Amino acid sequence: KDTYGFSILDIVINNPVNLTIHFGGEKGKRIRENYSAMIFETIVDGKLKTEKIFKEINEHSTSYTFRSEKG
């Protein structure tokens, strides 16, 4: 809840089809920069390159959707 904006109990109890995270006020903004910190390094032959997992989450994104067919 406090870092990514979803509750894991509601996912298990009643299996959703889609889950749009919303990025609202201060709490929402705090949550979004936890999605903006998804860069993985590999110490490239003496370098450091980070690729963001979540592509479109930028400083203007008000939401993000997780999608699935069944659940």
Binding site: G5, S7, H22, G24, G25, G28, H60
Partner: protein, 1001 residues
Amino acid sequence: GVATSFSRKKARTFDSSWNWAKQSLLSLYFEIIHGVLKNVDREVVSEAINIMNRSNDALIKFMEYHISNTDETKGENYQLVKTLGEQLIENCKQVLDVDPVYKDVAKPTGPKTAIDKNGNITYSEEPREKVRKLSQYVQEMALGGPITKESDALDKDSTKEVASLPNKSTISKTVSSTIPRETIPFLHLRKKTPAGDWKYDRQLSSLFLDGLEKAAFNGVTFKDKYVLITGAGKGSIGAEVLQGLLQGGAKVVVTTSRFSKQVTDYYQSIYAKYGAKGSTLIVVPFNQGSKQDVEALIEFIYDTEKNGGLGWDLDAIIPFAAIPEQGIELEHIDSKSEFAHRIMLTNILRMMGCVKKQKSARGIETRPAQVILPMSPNHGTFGGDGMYSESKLSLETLFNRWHSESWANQLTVCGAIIGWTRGTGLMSANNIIAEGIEKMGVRTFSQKEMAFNLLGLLTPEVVELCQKSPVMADLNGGLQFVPELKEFTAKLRKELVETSEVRKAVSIETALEHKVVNGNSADAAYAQVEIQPRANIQLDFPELKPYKQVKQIAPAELEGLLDLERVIVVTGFAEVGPWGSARTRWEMEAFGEFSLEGCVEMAWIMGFISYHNGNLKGRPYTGWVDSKTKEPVDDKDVKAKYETSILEHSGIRLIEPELFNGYNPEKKEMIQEVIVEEDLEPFEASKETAEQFKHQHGDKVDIFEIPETGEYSVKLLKGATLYIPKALRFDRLVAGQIPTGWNAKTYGISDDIISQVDPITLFVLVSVVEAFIASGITDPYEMYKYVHVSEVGNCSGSGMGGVSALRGMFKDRFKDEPVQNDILQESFINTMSAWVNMLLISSSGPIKTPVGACATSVESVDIGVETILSGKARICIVGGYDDFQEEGSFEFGNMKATSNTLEEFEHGRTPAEMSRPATTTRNGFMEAQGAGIQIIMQADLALKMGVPIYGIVAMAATATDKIGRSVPAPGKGILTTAREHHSSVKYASPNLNMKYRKRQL
């Protein structure tokens, strides 16, 4: 006034924007061909953008076929469509897969009070001098003016302007720097200083104006924005904020208070014009001064689709609704101002107080809802507002309470301070002083400008800024800088009131002097003679083009190729329906309103007006005369006297019992068999009837003879069977009926026949006679000067046809009412075509009668064309007819075929709104009454008679579906008229080519 109006089944969602762009583009297609709209018009630019907002892959393929098919040789307008059209096919392919955009285009207007020399005041909204844009309105609002001192291609080329629509404007001259130092803009946001007041901030307002400029160049987007807005009636700000929400893709609830058909046809027309791709629109009925509706509407929005709600969320709530208070001062503050304190203040707090309990339950705290409160600058400064001032002042306290209470995460307040919007129901009463208040430097806004200024409070620059601190938008043109706004208000009025009188009463005297110095009869020849129109009801035959013009349409090889004996042709047609004949139905169908020649026919149909010749009160008269009171009515006044009553009693309406022999739909009589439990009173009867009771009841009833009178006395004993009537409230209350007062006597049908024949044949004889009138046949025996007698067919049957003479036989003999002795004759389906041959045509052609039970008339055309092509008939009637009665209507009701009527009142539907083909919430059909026939004929003989050829029936077919166990279930059996073989689609058949068939001939 507190009484509830909301319900869950009275919502109307509007979601078919994928078809109001194929409609709106083809509506722009012919208004450029025929010359309605031209290259100058900014509305075509406005209608360009409402199609660029709705761009699918299927829509460009619609556009590409219609522009590539128009032929430029014929006209100059045909070249014009292909210039704009290929320019708009250019633009839609770039905005495809791009979110839609609100961009208001039209000319920003201004006020003008002009007083005529006769002393009449007129307020006219005039296009302004140096502000021809919304991009010029932005640079005006950033300059301020004199009183704030403290600290294109459009009208000359649409097709160039239409090209400049996808392209986003690239600038760097920032309008924040266009603000003069020591000059407040006209549109400034505010900031609370730590002393506690709200003062003008440069940087907050500069972030507002700069994004407001981009809102004029590029425009706002509102995709996935969910908005509540109340108080959105016609001609107010809430209707112009609505157009800017729907245009950008928002998903908007709009609540109305006066829920009608007029209101719901207006909200359909808004969405059929502005609603972009993905936008939606809900109209729910509403009360805001009711506590139980603000509870019940916020439930219905957030609640899920499994339980009937919407399942939505909300990202803006705009509670604008207000009632007028005027002339109401502090001693006259009463229940009207106390009902209106609750609309504008303490139920706005329960909208903001009840969306938070919907986000508390669902745990939603990362999606605020920006509240947009309408505020005022004048708190007590006008005269008797009532309690308008008190309500507005209270709203300002919310800014502080966002910091201090627990609802800062669900709601964010954004108070707007709307200036002089003129036209809206609060400030439309004084438009005449708006021109004088602008003489200072104060600015007034039309509604599309405070639409523009409030939709700048939803841009993603200021939406983020609301979520840090409250946002106060002061949108006055400097209307807080005029000293004594009340004193200067009445000063401008009393000058323009007196000049409107002193220029009026002076001009009325110099015309009274002028008729004394020179008299009346010297100037009596200086008035003119006007003329009122008369009604000239025409038959509307087809207008024939010259033979040079005709062969330009048809191919050149058709001449001599085509045998005219075996081409079938409609020669006449007529009908009788709920809107009278075929002529007064087309005026209601095509136009929605009657002409002057249709109010005259619909009054002659329903028997309102009535031709008088002779003397009226001694002096001679010739003209239309009311048939009730025998007093004259002019054709100029047939409308205003009778347009109400003709629209009351024609069309789909409530079932009127006088038309259907005492049938009340609400009281449907039924008899229930009971058993007597003791013996009844002796009633006296005649000899033959009391012997009939004894043969029936046997040993139960008791008949005895009365000695003096000679008539028997009948006693019932315990164990006999009675039939006591009951009555069943029945659901189906509405049917489309031939208008109230349609008499067959007014067409010339005698009482020898009306009293003897079925009511459905009176529908047919009027429809056969009027069909020769449309055919030029004035004497039905003119058909025999050319055709033999045994070559005039009559192939025209009904679905049920004679329902009124089946209850004469199954229901009125059993009741033993006085019935005719030949009712079985008049009940057949082939006997409505007997009175067409007994009272009319005396021919000996075929009389093949169809029955289709809902398709009786396309089958009848099929039997017709098949009859003529074999030469069995050279003329034949075709047509179909059916009568509406009580018992057929009840039995379609048990089949769930016709629609229930009490379900429809619960949805808020009106009777002129319940027959709806291809609709999302259609429910069944609406059973109607009447007839309709056509007279077909060879195309060889139609040229030799000299008759109006109205059409060419190229094809007629019928088809049966397949195996099943359900009769009313339709099927695709008539899909076998397109049957051809596609094994060999390589090379063109010469047989379908027409030059080849000419060479063989």
